[PDB]
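Thought: the user wants the 3D structure for the chain below. I'll pass the sequence to the structure tool as-is, report back what it returns, then summarize two notable features.
Action: structure_tool
Action Input:
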Amino acid sequence: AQKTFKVTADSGIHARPATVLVQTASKYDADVNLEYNGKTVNLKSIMGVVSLGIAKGAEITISASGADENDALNALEETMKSEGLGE
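Observation:
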């Protein structure tokens, strides 16, 4: 269970988008983590994503590993298409 998302947001993946994601994966008990700059941070880490400082024109690798790992990856996906944080 995992999917590569494209980062094309203007602000990037800072705290604002890190709070929208931590809320989605939060409902899922699966351990979904994002990948950026060779650093895998837990999707439930708003302060940990700030250290990455993602911006527009970048790539990220997500991977759900737990019980409903498949339900979590598609959950954050529809959230990225609702506002337009990545595809």
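Final Answer: Structure generated. Residues 69-83 form the longest helix (15 residues). The beta strands are 2-7, 33-36, 39-42, 58-63.
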